[PDB]
Symmetry: D2
Subunit: 240 residues, 4 copies
Amino acid sequence: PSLNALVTGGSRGIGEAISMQLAAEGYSVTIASRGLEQLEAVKAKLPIVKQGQTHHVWQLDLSDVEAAGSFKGAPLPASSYDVFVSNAGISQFSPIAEHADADWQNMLTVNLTAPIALTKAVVKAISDKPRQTPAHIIFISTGLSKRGAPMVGVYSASKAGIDGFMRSLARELGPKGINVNCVSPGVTRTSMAEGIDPSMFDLPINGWIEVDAIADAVTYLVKSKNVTGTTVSVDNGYCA
Amino acid sequence: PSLNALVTGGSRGIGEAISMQLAAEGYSVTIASRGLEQLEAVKAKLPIVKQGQTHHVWQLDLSDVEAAGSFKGAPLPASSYDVFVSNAGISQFSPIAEHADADWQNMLTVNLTAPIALTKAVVKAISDKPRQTPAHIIFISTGLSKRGAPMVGVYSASKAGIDGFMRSLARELGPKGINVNCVSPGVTRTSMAEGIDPSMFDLPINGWIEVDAIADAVTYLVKSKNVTGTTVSVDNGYCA
Amino acid sequence: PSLNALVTGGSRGIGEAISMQLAAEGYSVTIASRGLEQLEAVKAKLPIVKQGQTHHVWQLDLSDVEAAGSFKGAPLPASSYDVFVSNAGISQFSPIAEHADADWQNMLTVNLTAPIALTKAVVKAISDKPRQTPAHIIFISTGLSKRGAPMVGVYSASKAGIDGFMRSLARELGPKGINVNCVSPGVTRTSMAEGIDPSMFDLPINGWIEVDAIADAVTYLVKSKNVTGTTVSVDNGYCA
Amino acid sequence: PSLNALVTGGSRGIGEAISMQLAAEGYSVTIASRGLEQLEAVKAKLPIVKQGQTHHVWQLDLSDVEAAGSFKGAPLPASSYDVFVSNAGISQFSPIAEHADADWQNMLTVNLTAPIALTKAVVKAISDKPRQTPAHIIFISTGLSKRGAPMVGVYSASKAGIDGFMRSLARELGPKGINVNCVSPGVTRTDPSMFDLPINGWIEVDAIADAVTYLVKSKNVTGTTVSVDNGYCA
């Protein structure tokens, strides 16, 4: 019986790769973000490997906190999900003194406030459902959340925020059969990696990480039962 | 002359205790909080130990990001401060499912959004002033930011956000002669740690932490020059 | 081509589970420990799934630093290995005051000194060999290396030492095509966690962790290419 | 009334700076180290500021685990101490492949094995002594124990080992009135261009002693590291 996964930012980059992997594994994947044409294009490519497995699109403005918390427009009830991958995020680089208020505040809402609201919505809906195997909530974070760099003050803040949220949720939700973790990418070949590149950081493994490396970590977590409250870092050694 | 320190949440508890020690060390202290009456009382209490040391109040609503970012109502120029202690915060305890949106959203604002704004104003105003000794920006975090607990989801996220902000600022502002750190209190005796008490945690050292011990850490940091990107944990071993 | 994996402490519990899983992936596995009969029984069970895949035993006293350092008695030279999993270790519980000297010194040797020698030999043998994909060095650590508990002082030291070794080696060897990581199990069903059980720790996920859960993280790492200098924690939330 | 503090490696660099500052605060400092001539020079200059304060030297081979363990040749019994600062340690830089076995084994012994033995002897002697404020056990670690760099494999291991010891001890001994912490220096004058540092330059020894002193006067800090590393671990 195909389990349901929700992947925000599922239409591109890391989130696409995740959704593709979870679909290959038999998960009924809902992919959520803004662009309806992009979502549909990914949904067509999602493998269907088990009978009764169905994919879905959710046109969701990732910066609208009330939409996320109300789960507005979603193809399924929040209570349907056994996997939620919060991959939703924006990156911005700037010295803090020059960081435009509309920008950093938007970044904070996309990366932190909205996922909090989404997460509440999911947990309320699935907490007391019977299980036998844990549900999983997995956030995509970043090496910058744990090892500081110049010019990413607010970016770093938003995703360190997510790390602290994960750790507390893990403790709270563990007794309810929900496991909660982060996957922390380094510099990965995507957009929002537009501008930044690997040679800007002191990496033990030089060069780009491909998107499928980050999805391998998500898949590993989804299949696991005794991992909660952790980060799986896929960063070419940035945080070493 | 006597260096200027700004301390938000300075009108009671930890921030009062931090302002008292700073005054005692000769700092001219600006104290900011919503409650003008409580502010004026604290101001009257602050030691005056050398000539040309002067203290001030700043009625500042800690939940107004715009006000905070514009230094609105401030009694001195943002450029005057050589020490900024971002002590402002709210703590709320709730299962995440049951956490009222208005409550957790105000908490994030007070604990993270507004301090970012306020930090941006200070950094903008002081980054270029010349120094032979570092200036200091010190955030007050919590043990819960690094070691997860039930029922403190958003609280933990806000303060781990501050931790992430801190590390990245430390990197960015280091070569500018600004040192950036956190002090992380455990369960401290304040009308603030309300209902929740030391027995509720696994603690190597039982009992309450007095506000003066938090202030001790801040004072230590203010007088240091080679300490940046770090947390001083005063938590009775909570994070051990 | 079948790659060679060396797995110390390979004869039971976690080590046996890792060896079984690597063999099922097509690795030629060398399992090394003191007890020959147990060794041979495990070897006989290792899957043989492809051409050119051979398994071996290496009777090695994991307390003998010189023998580890010189590959004394080993069936293949150090230069053969693309994977080295250091699972070798002893645990002991005692208040520090009462921890008998011979015992804790022997634990230090088995858990830290001998693996450092073993690692030195692998690294010196394989460092200049050419590689398209990275070689892997993986240490088995413990949640206790990162979160403190009573009565495990020297045990925690030994395994934290391993963690510290891992991060530095990761930086050192990354440019040589060798990825270095820890897997950190929690309380795991083995005749090794003797005396100690899960109930003595504050765990979000109650109960014993099965040896396969630890092997799964090892297998994940071995199949990856962009993970280095990290820990993968499989601890039912102990470190959360 | 002046309390006894033990500071190993107390004759040079960071240890001397620590011995000096503790002496300035009222502590009777016993300093332990191999170099007996330098021990006396430093004992000669330690501040006297409190009635009854008296300083001591202890000739100790910091590699002799058994002498550490048994307080061999010490001027005071282990029971006398309310503060123990483990400053004791050797650093060595080498590719792991070329790191001489006698060198790295001896570093491990000095940095880890012998400090465990010493800690044991102290904890055994003081755990049951009544206390109004807590005793202190403070290890000197290094930024490299938490953040990896090349060519410092074993050194990093030895000092992360200390960190792991510190965290368990802090949980074990907190109920007995013993607080246990690390101070983690960066590159301290005793090179900084090796590392990515938000603050450029050397750290002076007194900045490390400042941390120790802060720890010593505190009551509610245990299980932690105070990092004075110019931002190395940021």
